[PDB]
Amino acid sequence: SKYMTPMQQKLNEVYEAVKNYTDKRGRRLSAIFLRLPSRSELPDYYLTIKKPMDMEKIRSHMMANKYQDIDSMVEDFVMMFNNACTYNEPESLIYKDALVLHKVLLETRRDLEGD
Numbered sequence: 293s294k295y296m297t298p299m300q301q302k303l304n305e306v307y308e309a310v311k312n313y314t315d316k317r318g319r320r321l322s323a324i325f326l327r328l329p330s331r332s333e334l335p336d337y338y339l340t341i342k343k344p345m346d347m348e349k350i351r352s353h354m355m356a357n358k359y360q361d362i363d364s365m366v367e368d369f370v371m372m373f374n375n376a377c378t379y380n381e382p383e384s385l386i387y388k389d390a391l392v393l394h395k396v397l398l399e400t401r402r403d404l405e406g407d
């Protein structure tokens with residue numbers, strides 16, 4: 293139980309790379325992405341976003357061993373960054389942070405290309 297399979301390790305590595313990324317000032321870009329607020333706290337959001345996504349949702353799937361491959365988890369991250377960029381303005385901080393984290397996601401996945 294305590295030992296992760298290779299796929300499980302890779303999933304975890306990608307998830308963690310995005311979660312733990314910090315910029316030069318020590319700011320964890322993941323902060324606002326961990327958990328999306330409520331439909332009642334964000335009326336305009338849920339009416340605009342077809343498939344809402346946050347890192348806690350991704351982390352829960354992973355922990356339930358529900359991702360079958362790396363691409364499946366990447367797709368959810370991509371949904372999240374797409375959602376953030378859709379809702380928010382191109383000059384907004386959330387939008388910029390979503391672009392940075394997107395790069396981290398693809399770099400990490402590619403750096404693990406074999407393993």
Ligand SMILES: O=C(O)c1ccccc1O
Nearest residue numbers: 324325328345346375376
């Ligand atoms: O724009 C947000 O505040 C947001 C927060 C968490 C997940 C996706 C998002 O677009």
